[PDB]
Design a protein around this ligand. Structure first.
Ligand SMILES: Cn1cc(-c2ccc([C@H](NC(=O)OC(C)(C)C)C(=O)NO)cc2)cn1
Ligand SMILES: [Mg+2]
Ligand SMILES: [Mg+2]
Ligand SMILES: [Mg+2]
Ligand SMILES: [Zn+2]
Length: 889
């Protein structure tokens, strides 16, 4: 297993100037002819000419039209094509080849493959070598001239990068199209699509140069009515890059294409973005509400890549976060501006501190710029993407909007033609930092540690107030736990956005202030502080850290009620919950360990319950925020704070706390569930696909959250509400009616009803599958086997497999059944899946990521299944590398 190291970067001894492709698609084979116009680079030392080429069937290879012969002048081992140095020309030469590939049996969805009746490619990161021979790495920039031919009736629509410059008929009912794309690009941005595609279409006129851009969004004919929101999102994305960043689109046309089989959300191929159908297609009649933010995010994300990834490119894959962290950051800014809801930022923080913090304290922990890799497919992590985005976001926090924009423009204008590194970005930001602080002596060299140092920093606080001198102090400490990447962790540059709240009237006591913590500890003093404040810390979640606020629950309640920052309010609530959870967990644990016949539990703080009631009953308060405060912290957030977590005890803890709050607030919950109905389920714009109301969707989120709480509590006659809910036109509602009915005898009735409503829309059915999968059912194992037999069967669609199994793995009580049968079941699915799609198999390993955090029995049960998986003779490199790292081998 070959390991690549970041320090080892060296430019190729070769240059590829021009790629000329002929891709001839037939029913049981695809013929790929390729001419590579090549040169010798200044780094050449007479080495062999080695191409990447995986799974290719060689018909012929040539140099300067001279056929090469195997054994004599080259060798091929299904991974690398080696041409011996003695036969490699010393100046400009032409390499050509003709290979056969088979998209129709390519179930790994990398390279060229068939998704239903669409031929489609995926080349990032190392998929282009599955189509034809290449020096498959992102610093090999080339021009592309691409011809695609296929049966006209099956594949009337032909797409590749660049301009279509010819369309022609071919004897035998075939046709071809030629695409020339003169600007240089890396091969991972190559793409091709062939199929019977239907489209929606628009023309966008850019803001400053008034260029006309044709916008096309494509799908299979059956779902062409689900394309409208996507097109609106694209328009919105283009406008935002123009308005915030002053950046216009540079090409004549942009195509978005949906396919049913895709490993991830989407891909930014130049002028030809290709999407998982679940991240491009929606209609109000057969999509749940989440689809609308999801499409907005993914369309936005792939668009913003056009600058941050496509015009400014990567030197090498270790720079991945430079395009991914930065593009997520740009999409985050976009989505916050489009949704105008505070829950947008809250949801990203919620995801970071659950999923990414878990990864960062796991054996898989890595910095956002790793030092090494084996399988590129394992590089695309929540650390690289989401912590990466928080690192990119901190620059904006430190600089402010004006200087951030100056810095970002410096970066783009300087690197627009070229490859870049994380250092280049920091450099540009630093120029802004110098200008802001007004001395060319200022620097951000310490900031680079955010790229190289792994692990989550912990930031803790102590406070002092002198009533007489009106002087307030915030003493701050930072610490990162040592791990395998650094034995000695260094202090980071941590920006701490803060406010000081007067507890007497709830007013701000100081202007907007960002503390720059650059040492292991510092003391920040404020004068003329009239009364003892309550500190509002890390507003907006201004750094990706564990916040230890050392506030009392009384102070936290006051913040939750009166602070101006959504995140600090939400975090104060989170912290109140965590204190309660840790306390009750230990009480339950001791009773279990000591086998107590009787014992006490600490009740939920009554003033906290009162504050929840106050906020819920405030007609001016935000509905999305409300749904957060009545929900306990995610299980994967909690587990960061507990050693040897017994999942049963945590489940009992959660139950107790939920029942405590419900015994006080259920009438309030019910009252609101009823009063929110009119606005939440307003059908006025149900048949307008361009009308999306994020506040209204948050109102539904709150209703469905309250209905869940009321159903679990068996609130009097709530089943009537559930039945009526099942008749709602909104899938978010009638699928919720299914899951909350889990606690009633009408479950399988609503199961059948909702299945009937879902079965004829591919994506909707997948949402139905998720809903069944996450149903709080005691017979959930039996239910899953029914899904397997009647619906999922032997589907190789990653959407189908992920829908059936992943939501179930978040069933705390059942997935973690002490028999280990949950672990056994998923490991079976991973091994099964690994046979045809290693990337998705590794995705299905997600629940195992916390294995060494659980109680000793469950650790052992998970380790046994991982070792069993590792012993499979046919295990992919992808899965083996992942499980080896995860199990500390
Ligand atoms: C075979 N292979 C595919 C990949 C890969 C992984 C992630 C994406 C990411 N896809 C994705 O939908 O990301 C969102 C949800 C928008 C943040 C990506 O960066 N798209 O631009 C794109 C491609 C690596 N190897
Ligand atoms: Mg405009
Ligand atoms: Mg070591
Ligand atoms: Mg299907
Ligand atoms: Zn991306």
């Amino acid at each position: 297993p070959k390991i690549h190291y970041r320090k080892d970067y060296k430019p190729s001894g070769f240059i590829i100037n021009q790629v000329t492709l002929n891709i001839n698609i037939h029913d049981q084979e695809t013929i790929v002819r390729s001419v590579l116009d090549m040169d010798i680079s200044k780094h050449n030392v007479g080495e062999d000419l080695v191409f990447d080429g995986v799974g290719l069937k060689i018909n012929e290879i040539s140099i300067n039209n001279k056929k090469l012969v195997e054994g004599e002048e080259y060798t091929y081992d299904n991974e690398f094509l080696t041409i011996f140095s003695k036969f490699v020309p010393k100046s400009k030469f032409a390499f050509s080849s003709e290979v056969i590939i088979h998209p129709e049996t390519n179930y790994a969805l990398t390279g060229l493959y068939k998704s239903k009746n669409i031929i489609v490619s995926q080349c990032e990161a190392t998929g282009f070598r599955r189509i034809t021979f290449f020096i498959d790495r992102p610093d090999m920039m080339a021009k592309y001239d691409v011809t695609v031919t296929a049966d006209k009736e099956k594949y009337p629509v032909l797409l590749s990068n660049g301009d279509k410059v010819n369309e022609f008929e071919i004897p035998g009912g075939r046709h071809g199209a030629r695409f020339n794309d003169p600007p240089l690009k890396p091969c991972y941005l190559f793409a091709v699509v062939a199929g019977d595609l239907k489209h929606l279409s628009a023309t966008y006129i850019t803001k400053y140069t008034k260029k006309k851009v044709e916008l096309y969004v494509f799908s299979e004919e059956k779902y062409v009515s689900k394309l409208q929101w996507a097109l609106e999102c694209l328009k919105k994305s283009m406008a935002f890059d123009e308005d915030y960043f002053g950046l216009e689109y540079d090409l004549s046309r942009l195509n978005l294409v949906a396919v049913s089989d895709f490993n991830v959300g989407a891909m930014e191929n130049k002028g030809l973005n290709i999407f998982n159908a679940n991240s491009l297609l929606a209609s109000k009649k057969n999509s749940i509400d989440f689809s609308y933010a999801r499409i907005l995010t993914v369309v936005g994300h792939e668009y913003f890549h056009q600058y941050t990834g496509n015009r400014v490119t990567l030197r090498d894959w270790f720079q991945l976060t430079l395009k991914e962290g930065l593009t997520v950051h740009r999409e985050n800014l976009f989505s916050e501006e489009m949704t105008k809801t505070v829950t947008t930022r809250l949801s990203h923080v919620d995801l970071l501190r659950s999923v990414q913090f878990l990864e960062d304290s796991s054996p898989l922990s890595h910095p956002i710029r790793p030092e090494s890799y084996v399988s590129m497919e394992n590089f695309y992590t929540t650390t690289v993407y989401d912590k990466g985005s928080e690192v990119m976001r901190m620059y904006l926090t430190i600089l402010g909007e004006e200087y951030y924009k100056k810095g970002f423009d410096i970066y783009i204008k300087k690197n627009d033609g070229n490859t870049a590194t994380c250092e280049d970005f920091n450099y540009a930001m630093e120029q802004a930092y110098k200008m802001k602080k007004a001395d060319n002596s200022a620097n951000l060299n310490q900031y680079l540690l955010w790229f190289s140092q792994s692990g989550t920093p912990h930031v803790s606080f102590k406070y002092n107030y002198d009533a007489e001198k009106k002087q307030y102090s915030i003493h701050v400490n930072q610490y990162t736990k040592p791990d395998e990447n650094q034995k000695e962790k260094k202090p980071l540059f941590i920006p701490i956005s803060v406010g000081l709240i007067n507890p007497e009237n709830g007013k701000e006591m100081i202007s907007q202030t960002t503390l720059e913590l650059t040492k292991e500890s510092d003391t920040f003093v404020f004068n003329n502080i009239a009364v003892k404040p309550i500190p509002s810390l890390f507003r907006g979640f201004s750094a990706p850290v564990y916040i230890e606020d050392q506030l009392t629950d009384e102070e936290r309640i006051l913040l939750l009620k009166y602070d101006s920052d959504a995140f600090v309010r939400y975090n104060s609530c989170t912290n109140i919950y965590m204190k309660q959870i840790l306390m009750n967990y230990n009480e339950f644990l001791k009773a279990k360990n000591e086998k107590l016949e009787s014992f006490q539990l600490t009740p939920v703080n009554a003033q906290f319950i009162d504050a929840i009631k106050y906020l819920l009953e405030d007609p001016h308060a935000d509905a999305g925020f409300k749904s957060y405060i009545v929900s306990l912290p995610q299980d994967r957030y909690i587990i960061n704070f507990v050693s040897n977590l017994d999942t049963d005890v945590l489940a009992d803890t959660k139950e107790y706390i939920y029942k405590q709050i419900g015994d006080k607030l259920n009438d309030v919950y019910y009252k609101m569930f009823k009063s929110l109905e009119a606005k939440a389920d307003d059908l006025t714009y149900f048949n307008d696909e361009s009308h999306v109301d994020f506040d209204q969707m948050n109102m539904r989120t709150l209703r469905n959250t309250l209905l869940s709480l009321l159903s679990k509590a068996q609130y009097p006659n709530i089943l009537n509400e559930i039945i009526e809910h099942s008749k709602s036109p909104y899938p978010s509602n009638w699928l919720t009616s299914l899951s909350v009915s889990a606690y009633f005898d009408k479950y399988f009735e609503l199961y059948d009803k909702t299945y009937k409503l879902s079965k004829d829309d591919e994506l909707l059915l997948q949402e139905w599958l998720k809903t069944v999968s996450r149903s709080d059912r005691k017979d959930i194992y039996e239910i899953l086997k029914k899904l397997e037999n009647e619906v999922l069967k032997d589907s190789k669609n990653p959407n189908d497999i992920r829908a059936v199994y992943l939501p179930f793995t978040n069933n705390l009580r059942r997935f973690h059944d002490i028999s280990g049968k949950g672990y056994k079941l998923i490991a079976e699915v991973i091994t099964k899946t690994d046979k045809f799609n290693p990337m998705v198999a590794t995705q299905l390993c997600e629940p195992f990521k916390l294995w060494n955090k659980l109680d000793t029995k469950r650790q052992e049960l998970m380790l046994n299944e991982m070792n069993t998986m590792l012993q499979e003779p046919q295990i992919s490199n992808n899965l083996k590398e992942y499980l080896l790292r995860l199990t500390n081998k």
